[PDB]
Symmetry: C2
Subunit: 89 residues, 2 copies
């Protein structure tokens, strides 16, 4: 595996989770649902796991999906700390 | 929203390798692309990260790298949570 394939994929996944699906995430991220849906499916295929429950009425993550998200949320918090060290200037 | 997170990873490699040439080799990228990304990065940040007087990083550039390093570690931890499951 390569943890450095595309860091934006981890960003999008954590945001779709945080905002309960592609409807809010598209407007939170200023991106189309089509791109967000494709990247998350391609991220699942690279990781070789099932992060998302395709059977639920609403968006829902698997047990593995919840662990992966919390790691994604940590990475995002660091990237915001990087930007916040600049916003002090 | 946030911008391209891969640039913070590119920046850390430029710093740890001490120049665009070395970082471009291990990343599999041309120097032009690598230089294009950091130029856009310094511009949107509004601060100078790398010194141009002599390779050397600026004071705020070193502070910014410290967070990029932590960001990469958490990205590595995320993949490990998958590799452990598989
Ligand atoms: Cl890695
Ligand atoms: Cl939705
Ligand atoms: Cl940002
Ligand atoms: Cl480019």
């Amino acid at each position: 595996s390569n943890a450095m394939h595309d860091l934006n994929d981890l960003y999008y996944y954590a945001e779709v989770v945080e905002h309960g699906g592609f409807s809010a995430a598209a407007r939170v991220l200023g991106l189309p649902k089509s791109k967000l849906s494709r990247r998350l499916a391609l991220l699942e295929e690279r990781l070789g796991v099932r992060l998302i429950q395709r059977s639920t009425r609403r968006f829902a993550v698997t047990d593995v999906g919840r662990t992966y998200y919390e790691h994604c949320k940590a990475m995002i918090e660091e990237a915001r700390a990087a930007q916040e060290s600049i916003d002090l200037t």
